[PDB]
């Protein structure tokens, strides 16, 4: 699908509210496999199961290994911009 830019707002006591799978070592993008109800990704409205996360706050995630992506994603705070695409 089309590449989208999506804003997520979260407070410091929360996680993103997603599960991810995939990663470069598996030959696939970082993929959202769950959107947890009521948590920030759900609340922001623009992130969905099946989205590939291409970047976060300008950090490319296209060739990142699974755990690299976990570290990068969990470091982001506050107003967080995602670049995502549904395939």
């Amino acid at each position: 699908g089309p590449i989208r830019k999506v804003l997520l707002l979260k407070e410091d006591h929360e996680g993103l509210g997603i599960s991810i799978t995939g990663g470069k070592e598996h030959g696939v993008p970082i993929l959202i496999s769950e959107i947890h109800p009521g948590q920030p990704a759900d609340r922001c409205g623009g992130l969905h199961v099946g989205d590939a996360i291409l970047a976060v706050n300008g950090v490319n995630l296209r060739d990142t290994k699974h755990k690299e992506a976990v570290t990068i994603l969990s470091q982001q705070r506050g107003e967080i911009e995602f670049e995502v695409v549904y395939v």
């Binding site: 996680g15 599960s19 991810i20 799978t21 990663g23 598996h26 947890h36 976990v70 994603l73 969990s74």
Partner: peptide, 7 residues
């Protein structure tokens, strides 16, 4: 099989 992480 791929890993899954909750974040």
């Amino acid at each position: 099989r791929w890993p899954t992480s909750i974040l």
